[PDB]
């Protein structure tokens, strides 16, 4: 029942008129991305963006992920253009091709990490552990906190996600619990496409 938007991938300069725009038309504009937020406006080209945290969390949430062009061209006219003509279509995972954003809000009855359990293990760079955990949770996944917190129950698939990028051994994991060990980029890639890429190329070689 509420319109609430958040911005991603702009300069302070460009953010200004998203603010001026917000107040003009009575739209709530928030600092950080929440669960009420229904709109993610972000910078494109005429409509491709860079992958931001808010980007992944927008697609994950099934939100409207609309370009910044929506604001520039609705001021250039006079009225509020309807975002539907302005939703993003890619980044550099997907070209302007595999429009994930659309795919997500349309396929909510059918989440991607549906029958899976995910441990976000170890250090991560510019995406806090819990923030990622939430991105996963939105896409049907169940989050686990230790490696020894995986379910006996047979219907479930254990998957350990690590960002190796931020360490200094992590081919280790496999020994401790027996579940596939994948780079973070598998989560990231899966949301951006909203498709759930198979584990093959994201699998981390392990030491027996």
């Amino acid at each position: 029942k509420r319109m609430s938007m958040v911005v991603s991938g702009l300069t302070p300069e460009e953010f200004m008129l998203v603010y001026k725009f917000a107040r003009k038309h009575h739209i709530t504009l928030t600092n950080l991305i929440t669960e009420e937020t229904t709109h993610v406006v972000m910078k494109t080209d005429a409509f491709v963006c860079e992958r931001t945290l808010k980007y992944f969390l927008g697609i994950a949430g099934g939100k409207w992920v609309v370009s910044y062009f929506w604001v520039t061209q609705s001021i250039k006219e006079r009225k509020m253009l309807n975002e539907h003509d302005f939703e993003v279509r890619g980044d550099v995972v997907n070209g302007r091709n595999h429009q994930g954003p659309k795919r997500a809000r349309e396929s909510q009855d059918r989440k991607i990490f549906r029958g899976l359990e995910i441990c976000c293990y170890g250090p991560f760079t510019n995406m806090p552990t819990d923030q990622l955990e939430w991105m996963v949770q939105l896409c049907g996944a169940s989050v686990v906190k230790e490696l020894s917190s995986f379910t006996l129950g047979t219907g479930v698939h254990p998957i350990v996600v690590v960002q190796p990028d931020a360490w200094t051994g992590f081919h280790a994991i496999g020994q401790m619990c027996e579940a596939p060990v994948v780079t973070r980029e598998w989560v990231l890639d899966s949301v951006a496409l909203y498709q759930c890429q198979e584990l093959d190329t994201y699998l981390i070689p392990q030491i027996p």
Binding site: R51, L53, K54, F56, V92, M127, Y202
Partner: peptide
């Protein structure tokens, strides 16, 4: 400074 981005796939 600004918002973090995320580069290439796997």
């Amino acid at each position: 400074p600004q918002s973090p981005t995320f580069p290439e796939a796997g």
